[PDB]
Write a sequence for this structure.
DNA sequence: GAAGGGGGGCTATAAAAGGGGGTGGGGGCGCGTTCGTCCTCACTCTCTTCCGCATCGCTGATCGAGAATCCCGGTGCCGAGGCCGCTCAATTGGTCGT
């Protein structure tokens, strides 16, 4: 996390409660959009320091997350990839991945190119799995993502 | 007109002077064959935009078929026209007691 990032007390409390010890605890953090939930997610990734997967409910959110990661973290643009049907960044070429539940949770036949990344995603283990707007997660298709992706801790 | 004869100019030679034109020298330029270029165009060959199917949030609408009514069988009641049993009440009378 670049020192430009400013962390508010409630944000710090939520992170301290999530990182009660040297081991990250899985669970849900409820913060308003104006409260900078994105920064907490980025901070958690910077804390875990391991390969992480961010999933948004829309392509607009995926764009927002990319901007926020660049805005708040030392990570370079090439190190971030937005695995999406509409756009390609050679996800296998970098460690940080961003996508959507509609893509990974997709029930119908995958495109040959998207299948390449998904198999790489399936085989790799994710240290942190950030889920945005998790109120949608209990959906029958979206919850499948949790069985498809292998993640050590999910926030 | 036929033709020959005479006078004068040309021709050369030297020399100087100062000046203009006659000449060929180098020259600029336009013209023009030659050529490819930059270029339009009309063929058309790739990046791109975008239509498609399933899913979400939340609700309504259709749906079959278990079930609110409708309906089968019992209660009884009182409806109905039998009828009898029997009583009472209406009638007569006399009797006679209170």
């Amino acid at each position: 996390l670049k020192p430009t990032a400013v962390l508010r007390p409630y944000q710090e409390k939520s992170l301290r409660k999530m990182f009660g010890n040297g081991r990250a605890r899985s669970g849900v953090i409820v913060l308003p959009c104006g409260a900078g939930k994105s920064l907490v997610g980025v901070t958690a990734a910077c804390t875990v320091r391991k390969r992480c997967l961010v999933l948004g409910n829309s392509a607009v959110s995926v764009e927002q997350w990319k901007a926020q990661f660049k805005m708040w973290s030392t990570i370079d643009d090439s190190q971030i990839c937005r695995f999406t049907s509409d756009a390609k960044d050679k996800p296998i070429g970098c460690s940080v991945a961003i996508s959507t539940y509609s893509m990974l949770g997709h029930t119908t036949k995958r495109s040959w190119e998207a299948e390449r990344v998904m198999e790489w995603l399936k085989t790799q283990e994710w240290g942190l799995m950030i889920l945005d707007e998790v109120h949608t997660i209990p959906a029958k298709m979206f919850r499948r993502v949790l069985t498809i992706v292998q993640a050590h801790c999910k926030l």
Remarks:
- The CA atoms of residues 125 and 150 of chain A lie 5 Å apart.
- Residues 59-72 of chain A form the longest helix (14 residues).
- The helical segments of chain A are 9-18, 37-48, 59-72, 101-104, 112-123, 145-148.
